[PDB]
């Protein structure tokens, strides 16, 4: 909820994104949906910065975070880990299936 409230508001409907998570294509298009409101927010935060160092740091932090290629995907970064997280879930489903096959 805390990762998707900044896109979809307070009533996130977490159940829909839990059953079907967002695609990398879908994660791109919500990053570009608020890309106009984020760059304007980075301008007003750099203007209200206390120092020129704090003004450069917010524009540099937002320039990295505006890029949707800078979205870290654990399926891309650690591929053998993400297939291990998949077979972690599928083994619990398989152990329930062996109990039904024994019956």
């Amino acid at each position: 909820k805390e990762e998707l409230k900044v896109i979809y508001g307070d009533n996130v409907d977490v159940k829909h994104f839990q059953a079907s998570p967002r695609t990398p294509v879908q994660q791109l298009f919500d990053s570009l949906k608020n890309a106009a409101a984020n760059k304007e927010r980075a301008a007003k935060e750099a203007a209200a910065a206390a120092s020129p160092y704090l003004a450069y740091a917010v524009t540099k932090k937002q320039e990295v975070q505006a890029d949707p290629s800078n979205i870290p995907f654990d399926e891309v970064l650690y591929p053998q880990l993400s297939e291990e997280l998949l077979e972690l879930e599928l083994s619990d489903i398989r152990e329930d299936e062996i109990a039904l096959e024994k019956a």
Partner: protein, 103 residues
Amino acid sequence: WKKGKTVSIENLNTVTDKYAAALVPKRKLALPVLPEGVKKAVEDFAASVGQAKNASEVSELLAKSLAEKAVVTEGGKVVEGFSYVSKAVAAKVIATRRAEVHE
């Protein structure tokens, strides 16, 4: 910083450049953002042939088709033959596997 000297803004900004360079993932999806120089060039050609009412919807299909085949880059260079299973695809695998065991 040296005891007699004083740290300057140019050295402080390359340090923040080093922090934000670590925010970039080691291996990332090259999720393409459609540039406005490409986006309105398509939308003026769509308005050239009378399709200005669906000129925007054409540019979304151009943006999605570039995004559906988004490639994986590591050092800026494309990792050749890289296969990844996303979290939305993996949760679709889990849900049909749960529905097999539940029925």
